[PDB]
Amino acid sequence: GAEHLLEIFYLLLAAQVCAFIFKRLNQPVVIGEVLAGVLVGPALLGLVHEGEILEFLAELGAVFLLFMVGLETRLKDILAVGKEAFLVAVLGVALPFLGGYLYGLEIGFETLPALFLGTALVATSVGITARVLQELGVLSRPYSRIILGAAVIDDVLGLIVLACVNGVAETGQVEVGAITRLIVLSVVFVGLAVFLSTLIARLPLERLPVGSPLGFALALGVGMAALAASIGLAPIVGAFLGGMLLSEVREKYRLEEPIFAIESFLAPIFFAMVGVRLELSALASPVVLVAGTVVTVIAILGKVLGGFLGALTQGVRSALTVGCGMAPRGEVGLIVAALGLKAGAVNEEEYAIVLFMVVFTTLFAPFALKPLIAWTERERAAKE
């Protein structure tokens, strides 16, 4: 009870300070937050441990980050680049998967673990990316919108991939009905969201028996997350979509600011808690470091190239920035790794090898992403 108030305190103070240290280095804040979680977490101070409660708070954090982003992101905006979104997504799943599975077959990983390698390489944590794009006030740009939309598609794709894989881990075949069911639930949910959001501005909440337009927004957001999560998608997606629903009425209701407040309350906990859940396996470990480094380069190159190719339309400058913005694996890669360990599909060694790369990718990606944003905005002025 005071356990959790204490822990939350630690997370907040560490995250505030680490954010200060990283702000003063012209480096993005997200890294500070994650490192704060590593700082106070098991790895170093052991002040903060993994709690069902701390994990859920972290979840809400990710949610509000994405609700915030969708609030400033309209359908017209993402659709108008939706083809590059789609392409970036599909290539982003295809390329590091094959690379993953192939590289698994070569070290000596068996068919099922190798499949899990490709699986982990498929994942994408737009939470982190979003945090950066938000910081540099860039959420409006084309590459950021392609990143968002493509991320949304990338989620349904990744879910199908994991459904297939857990399927072959449990019985050995892929339950086709389950797959198609997920595809239908996903497509219907997303399309229903989109439809709903071409109708939001036309109907101000006024006749709704709600007590405040904000309270309405919070429900039509947390609820969107919940819905997404019940279908089998990441809550972050329900969140983003819920944001889009209300983005054509955002300014009209003074929503941008109080949502931004909540986000900048819970998001640090989310990123910190990502840092909390990173393990000391890459410490004094060999095959882990070697195979890990290789699978890491395969991961980054897979994502970055998929992105570069899908949105090559906007010219190289944007294309890497999308690709690079698809790199980090964060809480997602962590999750796939955990499920991999549980169902007896991955040794603690192969788990160390995957964890190494979700850690390195999570760290590396937002570094490279910052100058890439500058090197794209400087070039956008010479054609402005």
- 185 lies in the binding site for a copy of itself (CB under 8 A): no
Q: How far is CA 384 from CA 77, 333, 379, 380, in A?
A: 19, 39, 9, 6
Which does residue 213 bind out of Zn ion, a copy of itself, none, counting CB within 5 to 8 angstroms by kind?
A: none
CA distance 123 to 157: 9
Residue reference for tokens 């470990």: 285
Cβ neighbours of residue 185 closer than 8 Å, sequence gap 6 or more: 231, 232
- 5 lies in the binding site for a copy of itself (CB under 8 A): yes
Of positions 47, 98, 216, 297, contacts a copy of itself by CB under 8 A: 216
- 334 lies in the binding site for a copy of itself (CB under 8 A): no
- 209 lies in the binding site for a copy of itself (CB under 8 A): yes
- 17 lies in the binding site for a copy of itself (CB under 8 A): yes
Residues annotated in the binding site, as ranges? 3-4, 7, 49
Least separation in angstroms between residue 121's CB and a copy of itself is 24
Check if the beta carbon of residue 301 is closer than 8 Å to that of residue 91: no
Amino acid identity for residue 25 in this structure = L
Which residue blocks in 72-197 are alpha helix, DSSP H? 75-79, 82-107, 111-122, 126-135, 142-170, 176-197
- 25 lies in the binding site for a copy of itself (CB under 8 A): no
Which does residue 140 bind out of Zn ion, a copy of itself, none, counting CB within 5 to 8 angstroms by kind?
A: none
If one counts every other C-beta atom within 10 angstroms of the C-beta of residue 19, the result is: 20
DSSP letters spanning 21-71: HHHTTT--HHHHHHHHHHHHSTTTT--S---HHHHHHHHHHHHHHHHHHHH
CA distance 244 to 48: 35
Least separation in angstroms between residue 3's CB and a copy of itself is 9
- Residue 248: phi and psi, rounded to 5, are -90, 15
- 211 lies in the binding site for a copy of itself (CB under 8 A): yes
Which of 340, 350, 341, 342 lies closest to 162, judged by CA? 340
State whether the Cα torsion 242-248-251-253 is positive or negative.
negative
Closer CB to Zn ion, residue 7 or residue 84? 7
- 61 lies in the binding site for a copy of itself (CB under 8 A): no
Closer CB to a copy of itself, residue 13 or residue 192? 13
Which does residue 49 bind out of Zn ion, a copy of itself, none, counting CB within 5 to 8 angstroms by kind?
A: Zn ion
Least separation in angstroms between residue 39's CB and Zn ion is 15
Amino acid identity for residue 58 in this structure = A
The residue count of the chain comes to 384
Least separation in angstroms between residue 65's CB and a copy of itself is 15
Which does residue 264 bind out of a copy of itself, Zn ion, none, counting CB within 5 to 8 angstroms by kind?
A: a copy of itself
Interface ranges with Zn ion (CB under 5 A): 49
Check if the beta carbon of residue 129 is closer than 8 Å to that of residue 366: yes
Least separation in angstroms between residue 24's CB and a copy of itself is 9
Closer CB to Zn ion, residue 49 or residue 378? 49
HSE-up (13 A, CA, CB side) for residue 293: 5
- 20 lies in the binding site for a copy of itself (CB under 8 A): yes
- 234 lies in the binding site for a copy of itself (CB under 8 A): no
Closer CB to a copy of itself, residue 14 or residue 300? 14
**Which structure tokens are listed for 28?**
């993005």
Q: Which stretch binds a copy of itself (CB under 8 A): 104-112, 144-152, 225-233, 365-373?
A: 225-233
Of positions 108, 191, 223, 371, contacts a copy of itself by CB under 8 A: 223
| Site of interaction with a copy of itself (CB under 8 A) | 1-2, 4-6, 8-9, 12-13, 15-17, 19-21, 23, 29, 32, 52-53, 56, 59, 209-212, 214-216, 218-219, 222-223, 225-226, 229-230, 235, 257-258, 261-262, 264-265, 268
